[PDB]
Assembly symmetry: C3
Homo-oligomer: 94 residues x 3
């Protein structure tokens, strides 16, 4: 599992959401941030190793405009994910 954090332009949320849905990603977290100011949107998703490259490419395509200030995507390790409702703990290790 990897955490994918995309800092995008606010108006790119919808096409990014569509790109994620069509990519099989269920669930994402969004928050407002200031990118140094310019208002930006932080999107957080945690996906399996196999779909990381695919998601990033979909995210880049959807969030891209071509001009300066398009943002960045950060990829970081996540050991486990726990579903609160059931207490189900999923751990992925190399």
């Amino acid at each position: 599992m990897k955490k994918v954090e995309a800092i995008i332009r606010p108006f790119k949320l919808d096409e990014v959401k569509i790109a994620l849905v069509n990519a099989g990603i269920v669930g994402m977290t969004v928050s407002e941030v200031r990118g140094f100011f310019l208002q930006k949107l932080k999107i957080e998703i945690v996906v399996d190793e196999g779909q990381v490259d695919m998601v990033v490419d979909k995210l880049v395509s959807a969030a891209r405009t071509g001009e300066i200030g398009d943002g960045k995507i950060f990829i970081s390790p996540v050991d486990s994910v726990v579903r609160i409702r059931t207490g189900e703990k999923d751990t992925e290790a190399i």
Copy 2:
């Protein structure tokens, strides 16, 4: 050392806070996020490996309602925690 971040229903803040305090956890960071939507709160804490299971369990018990949309908890590696007031840096191998 692990970063434990929980995305919970906003009305679960107080009970999660209580659970965390009773569990010996001192200090948490709370941010407002939108979970795709519904308003959610992101709770961040950092703890030693030997506390993770216990902390996650208290977190699940406190944040759950049994209804779909209870949220999730992500466990990830943290290299260091620095206390700004004292400048003390606490580092652990990942």
Copy 3:
């Protein structure tokens, strides 16, 4: 490549921004958070190279500290890669 997350007193933003600028740090994301009772804080996120971490943390602490309880925390974690959205360039850093 490390993620540096600093939770600081809101009024320390400008000092921290200045510290990071003359430290060669370009780009940071800032958000409002509550540090627990509740106290308004600012979350500053930056991703720097391994060789910059120690220096950046030192500058951050010097900038954000007051000496009073509640000055905040800085969490340092691993980042596998950084992808520039515009060009699609994936940057990885290792040793």
